[model samples]
Target: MEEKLKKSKIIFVVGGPGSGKGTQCEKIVQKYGYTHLSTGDLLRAEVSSGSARGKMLSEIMEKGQLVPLETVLDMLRDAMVAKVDTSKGFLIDGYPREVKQGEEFERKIGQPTLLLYVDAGPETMTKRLLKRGETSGRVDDNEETIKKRLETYYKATEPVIAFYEKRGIVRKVNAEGSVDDVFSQVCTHLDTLK
Candidate 1:
């Protein structure tokens, strides 16, 4: 684990739902070959595993509650450990919603080399999520949960970006445009790492 920290780059991708953060992550992984891990996806898989912990996660998720940080941090640690030998870096998406989360992550895993903040207006994000709910079939995609999620994000997650700003590692991308347009802005930020 210690060796992996020295050899690998860690990028934290943070945004509200419907911000197209995951789409940008795919493009990043395609171009940079970083291993991308979305915490939401990880938790979803766990929630479906039918394990005791998974059961607990599902209950919390359905209520739009953030799962305990240790639960997520451990999963992330295990995932990173499994890929340590093969990975060039990691794109940790949908994580560190609070300032403390980011602090704990760096203390245990590695210091982030970059924090990509995908910024979009609340109305746009709400519309995007509502549109997705028409077919996504995900419980959290509904209006009530989406509003709760956005509120939680603003109250807790927005400070995470501010925290990273103090470290001068945050790169903000405007996410109100087309995917390609957003990708171009995202690229400009990633390009600086070169």
Candidate 2:
């Protein structure tokens, strides 16, 4: 059976690490009054808090292994349900990284109005990762870990882009310039959706 479309406007912003997904999501929230939800931040918070799930996450993260899809989906569903009463729309970050993940998201939260894919070249991404690694102190930012993450992203998450494209909700944005310049293009694309 076809699922009923969700009433709220949900926008999924996806890209490889250092693709400026967070930067663009900030602009989107500021300009469009959308609530920003970054699942990575939430998971990191959970790990820092030392909850049961957080312990599990910490162990997996310490080993540089990707978190299980079910865990991510559970967190996402919980977060979305908690915000159901909010009037502002949502801009979701770091989600639907695999085809099954996307399917589960649709089953849980209904269809999003749009999916924004921030496109960046490997050279740019590597540069961004190196800079971020130097400043962020994140273990995953190291050269070896970053390479694995990127490889996993292409192998797993890249197909999700095609999934959204087939549904005609994926909008591509070149995330290659300064923050403002990239945001300008994002805003232009989002404007057309309204």
Candidate 3:
């Protein structure tokens, strides 16, 4: 366990729902060979898996509230242990959405080498999500739910970003442009960090 912990490289990716966090993570993984672990996608899978945890996740997500951090950490830690390639590193997405969650991860596993923040205004995110809702078929993509998610993010997740910012590991990128344009900036940052 100690050896596994020592070799692991973690990068926490934080952003609002439509900030292209999902899109850019794919690019990063493709280009950099990091394993992408998305808690949002994991929870969605749980919700469909029909396990008892899935019911719990479905209820929490529909309300636009976070799943309990303990459950999140348990599942994520397990997946990381099983799936992560220590040589390639990891990009943990849409997680550690609160300061305490980040603290817990640090305590249990290890500190993230970088915290990547994809910055975008609510207007841009809202427009993007609304357009996605047109054909996305995600249950939580509606106006009311999206507003709640943004509010939840401002109240809960944004603090996590500020917490890492204080520690000086944050790498922020403007997420307002095309995918390749944003990815170019992201790649530049990752290069510098390397």
Question: Could you say which candidate leads in TM-score?
Answer: 1
Candidates 2 and 3: which is better by TM-score? Answer: 3
Better of 2 and 3 by lDDT: 3
Q: Tens-digit lDDT track for model 2 on 142-172? A: 4786788788888888898988888899988
State TM-scores per candidate: 0.87, 0.84, 0.85
RMSD of each: 2.8, 3.2, 2.9
lDDT of 1: 0.86
What is the lDDT for 106 in model 1?
82
Model 1 Cα lDDT, one tens digit per residue, 1-194: 68667457889999998888998999999998999998878888787789787898889878998688888888788889989889878999887888899989988888899999999999988888888887777756346888888999999999998888999999999998899999999889888773
Which candidate leads in lDDT? Answer: 1
Error of 3 at 140 (Å): 8.6
User: Model 1 compared with the native: what TM-score?
Assistant: 0.87
* Positional deviation of residue 45's Cα in model 3 after best superposition, in angstroms: 4.0
Question: Residue-wise lDDT of candidate 3 within 35-72, one digit each (tens)?
Answer: 89888777777778998888988888789986688887
- Those runs of model 3 whose alpha carbons end farther than 4 Å from true positions after fitting are 46-66, 85-87, 138-142
Query: RMSD in angstroms, candidate 3?
Result: 2.9
Model 1, C-alpha of 169: deviation from truth (Å)? 0.3
